[PDB]
């Protein structure tokens, strides 16, 4: 059996090519999934561009996908052929200190290894994952926005300890993570201030996602202080995100694995009793929660475009586009 | 120098009389409030029935009220005459361990003393309260008058339940004043909210409009179990059903109105399921400010039923006992 | 091929039953719509109850709905599969004296015929309507489904009342589906808007957020008289309390839901005060587009009470008469 | 007794002198008002500049004012000493075809004569006006003094424009005294209001707080077209808007000022070009009530004492003025 796939033998977007590949077969504890939709994320871009080493080489990227189970590996029970599933993207052992306390994305054994980075991912017709990573859902186009976009945002909001009344600023609120951070900050009862430079073009979308106000970076300085800043853009908005925080403010940062180094004002940190909280991925337990919330309609998938596998390079480049407002998906 | 008020020299609903009393005067750290609206709650009823002892005697009840500052006593800054305010109803010292950790309703010096139970209350044209308890508000005062007991109690129950988004929250007594706010807060916190009511045939849609995702009779609630959280402001009435529907790690939060009750608690089920049985009363002084701002922002909603003049206080207490419809009963002096 | 639908073969609320029925197919100039939301209105109640004759029989009611275009029939253009639409509910020919002057609800060829009364309606998964009656909208379809009766009727009443800024406009039945939008349009045209309601405490906040400057009981409205305009969407229910509040040159704009509505008019008061009694029904096809555009812009608001599934259609229709109800009841097939 | 007043004997701001004058006495049908606030408008500037003849001479200008009734003339009833009032500025006879149909500003007997132009006006401690022109008000007289010209002229333009909810209304010169109320009335009537300004950054927030849905420069407005209504308080829209910005059935209303007009475009688009001036006496009562109810708002820039009347008038032309200038005698 042969399948279509987007693969690169050397990093660089220019080397990402449509190829024909041996359709993998699921081993013990694994399932084979017919990928229906895969997300296009800064992480996928950075994998292809070479900012993070991938395996195997040549490499099929794509760390966020949903599809239908094609074959269950020997001794696999719990999910079976025909089941629509969405895939939690971290490999985890289930027996180390981190997995047993819920932080599967910190697994000491797998290093937090990401499907589509340390294994072949979803920019292909078929992919093999662990069966325990595959979550049956009745939601697949919307579900394919969950493994990175929604789950990362949930994990940030969870780690910020937002409480009703608290002023929450979301930097990068039009990005895949930020759009779900707006939603989760509102669902936890926050007063939600969404920040984008394109406020005029995007204000309707962001309020639809739960924002109480949309602000440019310079206006947010005037709306300070905030009790929480959710900043999924890494080091990119560090200067603005730290200075708008009030007493006891929580700055939650996540990122897409690219170089990020900043200058921390210790005097302000200790004087204001601010917390700078790292977040990455999400817990395996909370992925089930995010899937159920999508099924219940309590969170929403904001889609910009769906592209065939053959347009994967243009889809990746559309992450940079000022006209893009929402998620870009690939459909093998 | 004189004011109208409702008062009783001895307990009993029959003994609640419209009188003329000496208009009280604010001392230092106090304000005098022209009462615009006072809530009618189970607590007030039980004070007038004698189920809870009041002081002084004879007694003006009314522990939930809003109005306009008429006079500021010595040393008072930050409120002036004309200010519409809604009154936090727990006296608190600010210096004990409970106050200093924010549990001002547990003050060790005042014993949690409730305005209108250990002081004269708001069933009167005027009342005196500490200035630090009077919160300035731009909300309509009829709606503000639902906050000191109804909303704040419900908030404090929901806060003590550590509700996480997605968790299933059942609210028992969801048509009552506390319960209808418990539905709103459970939803505001991301819960999936199931309002339980024997009257679902009549109250289903009003409870949906308060934020419930579904409304269930008790028999349907058994089939919808398990729940992660049960909020029960009605004390001992619903105990076996509220406790039986809880899942692993479930939290049962109970509040009451100082009527005595006892339940039979199966500790084996409690420890086998790692359930928590959590008492809640009143709310935190800091959280009352938050509740006031949430009303002003329209993030929660005051469900009102009828306003009665002071002279119909007996009719008003009766309407609490057998309501024509769901919502808060107010007294307007 | 088969769809679920609420239908009745003889009138009476007890005979409205969930059935399976042939999915209808769109003939020329017609579209098939997957109904997302249908309004529950007094008009739908009166059709099911027998006050109005429906065709065909057995009959699927529901004159107010929005949804997603599923199939376009022969000859249809500019309306494609998946387009969310809300349905103008009057059948019109486009060529008679009434249609050509804009009064499409007065069409002389179709007789003003209302979709879901003279055709099968929206209390089903699918309904076929004329393509030109389907208005594309980017509004949430839950909100859009409050427009074809509630907002459009209200708009048409306010428009025919010649309201000018400053004028005192009383809206009776102000919490009904039409009334709540009539508050909004009277205010949008510049009126000083008095919402008249006897349950004033319960509905004041919602009516003020719809744009009422004040909320008065009917007896307070007698004391606040004179008014320049009464918007009255309740048939004959309010006439005997409200007609007397109009001053000189006042306009009494009457609409209703097709039940008997005979009243006694004092011709002497009418001619002595130069009052106009102005009939209003439905609205103009052109104005429906405007009302849809105003909802998309946020200039008018849909005030929802609850959404029921199609199986609960009898409960939804009876909730229309509930003392508990404030706001729109929707059916979601 | 004597009063302070600004008067001129020959035209020109530099000839507007502070003098002492006999306080006038109210005759039949008149009241004496102690002026509290008087507006500064282009009309007062042009009267003082000599562009409009005035009487009597020497002349006290000031056509927009509010104050307190000090004395009622013989036989006057209805309004009483001590009443705060704001003055409708058109003399009207009450008996001709215009007055009887409500167009008092068109009165055929008085010629539309304006108080402070054909009578001594409000830039003085006291002024005499007809009793029927004084409207009692519970509004702050500071804000009331913005109504007889600013608010009323704008109301009359929006009235004559037949604005329907949803119509797109462009207001030219939107920071002017009339323009800023025109923004408000266009919004109060349901319009979608585009305020046009060359000073867009300086005034955007002020125009939004007056009810403008957008603030545009003249070149940005070319793209927002077409408009159903163009309100042009000063007759200057031809410098900021091509006649082509008006849509089908479009209405252009001007309350001030020769221009060149494509008749073919006018009849082909069924456009209306509509003149407006002052306001109807009945509508003045309505404007006063809307201010009292907070439904329209007075945007003030500065208040000057009567001694600074020359600076107040000249401030009408300052590029730094955003809002109304008042004199307080
Ligand atoms: Cl992104
Ligand atoms: Cl209704
Ligand atoms: Cl000006
Ligand atoms: Zn592990
Ligand atoms: Zn204490
Ligand atoms: Zn016709
Ligand atoms: Zn005349």
């Amino acid at each position: 059996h042969e399948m279509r796939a987007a693969a690169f033998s050397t990093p660089g977007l220019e080397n990402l090519k449509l190829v024909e590949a041996e359709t993998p077969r699921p081993g013990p504890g694994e399932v084979l999934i017919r990928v229906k939709y895969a997300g296009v994320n800064p992480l996928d871009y950075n994998v292809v561009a070479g900012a993070v080493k991938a395996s195997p080489m040549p490499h099929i990227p794509g760390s966020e996908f949903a599809g239908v189970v094609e074959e269950a590996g020997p001794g696999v029970t719990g999910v079976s052929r025909g089941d629509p599933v969405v895939v939690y993207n971290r490999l985890y052992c289930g027996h180390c200190r981190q997995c047993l306390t819920g932080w599967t994305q910190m697994c000491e054994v797998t290093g937090g290894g990401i499907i589509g980075i340390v294994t072949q991912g979803g920019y292909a017709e078929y992919a093999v994952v662990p069966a325990k990573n595959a979550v049956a859902t009745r939601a697949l186009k919307e579900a394919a926005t969950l493994p990175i976009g929604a789950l990362t945002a949930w994990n940030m909001a969870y780690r910020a300890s937002i409480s009703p009344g608290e002023k929450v600023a979301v930097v990068g609120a039009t990005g895949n993570v930020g759009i779900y951070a707006v939603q989760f900050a509102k669902l936890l009862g926050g007063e939600v201030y969404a920040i984008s430079r394109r406020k005029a073009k995007v204000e309707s979308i962001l309020k639809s996602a739960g924002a109480d106000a949309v602000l440019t970076p310079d206006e947010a300085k005037s709306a300070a202080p905030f009790d929480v800043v959710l900043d999924p853009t890494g080091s990119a908005s560090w200067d603005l995100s730290f200075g708008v925080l009030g007493r006891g403010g929580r700055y939650v940062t996540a990122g897409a694995l690219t170089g990020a180094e900043v200058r921390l004002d210790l005097r302000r940190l200790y004087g204001m009793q601010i917390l700078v909280i790292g977040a990455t991925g999400g817990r395996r337990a909370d992925f089930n929660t995010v899937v159920r919330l999508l099924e219940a309609g309590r969170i929403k998938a904001f889609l910009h475009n769906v592209y065939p596998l053959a347009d994967v390079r243009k889809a990746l480049e559309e992450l940079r586009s000022p006209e893009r407002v929402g998620k870009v998906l690939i459909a093998p």
Side-chain angles (χ1 to χ4, degrees), chain A residues 3-21 23-52 54-200 202-238 240-262 264-291 293-299 301-316 318-319 321-322 324-332:
Chain A
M3 65 177 177
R4 300 182 321 118
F8 63 97
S9 64
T10 301
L13 199 58
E14 65 277 1
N15 299 312
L16 182 66
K17 291 171 188 181
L18 205 64
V19 319
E20 257 76 15
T23 306
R25 297 292 292 280
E30 299 174 354
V31 300
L32 180 68
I33 295 174
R34 174 78 178 74
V35 175
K36 297 290 190 193
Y37 297 95
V40 186
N41 304 97
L43 178 67
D44 302 302
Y45 192 103
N46 289 327
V47 169
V48 167
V52 77
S55 300
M57 297 296 285
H59 195 259
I60 299 165
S63 287
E64 185 182 47
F65 54 93
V68 177
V69 181
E70 183 74 40
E71 181 181 7
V76 161
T77 79
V79 61
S80 70
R81 190 173 144 83
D83 290 337
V85 298
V86 57
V87 178
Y88 176 73
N89 80 355
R90 305 297 178 117
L91 298 176
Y92 61 106
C93 74
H95 72 252
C96 70
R97 163 73 196 179
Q98 304 297 151
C99 289
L100 290 168
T101 55
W103 297 106
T104 46
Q105 78 271 48
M106 302 288 103
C107 181
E108 296 173 346
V109 164
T110 65
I114 297 185
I115 284 163
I117 299 178
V118 304
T119 69
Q120 300 291 42
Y123 290 180
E125 287 181 301
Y126 297 93
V128 164
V129 299
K132 69 183 194 181
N133 284 238
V135 174
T137 176
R138 64 173 174 86
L140 295 180
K141 212 178 304 201
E142 306 186 332
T145 78
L146 298 178
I148 290 180
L151 180 55
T152 292
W154 167 275
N155 190 67
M156 293 171 76
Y158 176 58
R159 289 171 60 78
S161 304
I162 294 163
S163 49
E166 284 204 311
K167 294 167 66 171
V168 184
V170 181
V171 172
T174 64
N176 295 345
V177 177
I179 187 84
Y180 271 114
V182 169
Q183 297 181 50
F184 290 124
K186 189 52 151 297
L187 195 72
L188 288 162
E191 187 176 289
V192 177
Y193 290 79
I195 301 165
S196 53
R197 292 176 264 89
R198 301 167 290 161
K199 150 172 182 181
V202 306
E203 181 154 13
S204 205
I205 299 95
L206 291 183
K207 294 209 184 174
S208 161
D212 302 289
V214 185
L215 308 175
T216 61
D218 291 343
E219 289 171 326
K221 300 182 183 241
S222 306
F226 300 102
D227 302 290
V228 176
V229 175
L230 306 188
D231 180 356
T233 82
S235 61
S237 318
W238 169 266
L240 155 87
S241 299
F242 192 86
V244 302
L245 283 168
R247 295 169 163 79
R250 289 129 279 155
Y251 169 71
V252 180
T253 173
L257 285 178
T258 180
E261 169 146 309
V262 297
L264 173 73
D265 187 336
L266 280 177
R267 208 157 38 152
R268 205 179 148 68
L269 181 84
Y270 92 87
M272 298 292 281
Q273 289 206 147
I274 279 163
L275 297 90
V276 173
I277 303 168
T280 190
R283 305 184 311 155
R284 179 71 179 81
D286 297 339
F287 187 54
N288 301 333
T289 299
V290 167
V291 167
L293 291 170
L294 182 70
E295 284 165 358
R298 298 289 289 268
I299 58 180
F302 284 90
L303 305 175
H304 179 70
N305 245 317
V306 178
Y307 281 105
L309 247 199
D311 281 305
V312 68
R313 190 186 283 145
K314 179 176 171 204
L316 285 161
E318 191 157 304
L319 291 174
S321 156
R324 172 220 160 196
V325 181
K327 185 82 170 195
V328 172
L329 297 175
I330 301 306

